[PDB]
Design a protein around this ligand. Sequence first.
Ligand code: Z5I
Length: 168
Amino acid sequence: MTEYKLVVVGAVGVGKSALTIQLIQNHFVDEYDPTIEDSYRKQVVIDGETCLLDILDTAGQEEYSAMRDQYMRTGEGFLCVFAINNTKSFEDIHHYREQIKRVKDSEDVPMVLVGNKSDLPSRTVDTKQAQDLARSYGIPFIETSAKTRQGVDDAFYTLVREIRKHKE
Ligand SMILES: O=C(O)/C=C/c1c[nH]c2ccccc12
């Protein structure tokens, strides 16, 4: 059984825990819980391949940065989810960019940049900015939301494919 080691990156307000639980047990939690250390091991039949998807929900802060480097070198796939509710989440991408680039010891690595909470009326971050930026690195941008739950599964299924392509 293929055991994929992935980690999610973001900040407080994104709601990465609400996105994970929605795909772990198909449930949407409204309450925001401060996640510090949570690992999700769920079996997914990706294109017919029943594999295990281990997802570690990291804190949306910079308090455990010394511990970040630990799984940052172990995780192959980086789930980058930014909220269009804040333009800062679109700026912090540069921080993680140079951060991952260093710890990964490579300029390339299977990463996906997706937007969350697009169903919110506060569209501070427009799709053109996201698409153009995504096109700079050549990464697929997927509009997602656990509130409306549209194309969420697609993002996960195609994500694994990128990991496969980075190997074979
Ligand atoms: O060290 C532990 O006890 C757990 C580590 C991890 C659990 N899920 C992960 C996903 C990517 C990288 C590391 C992990």
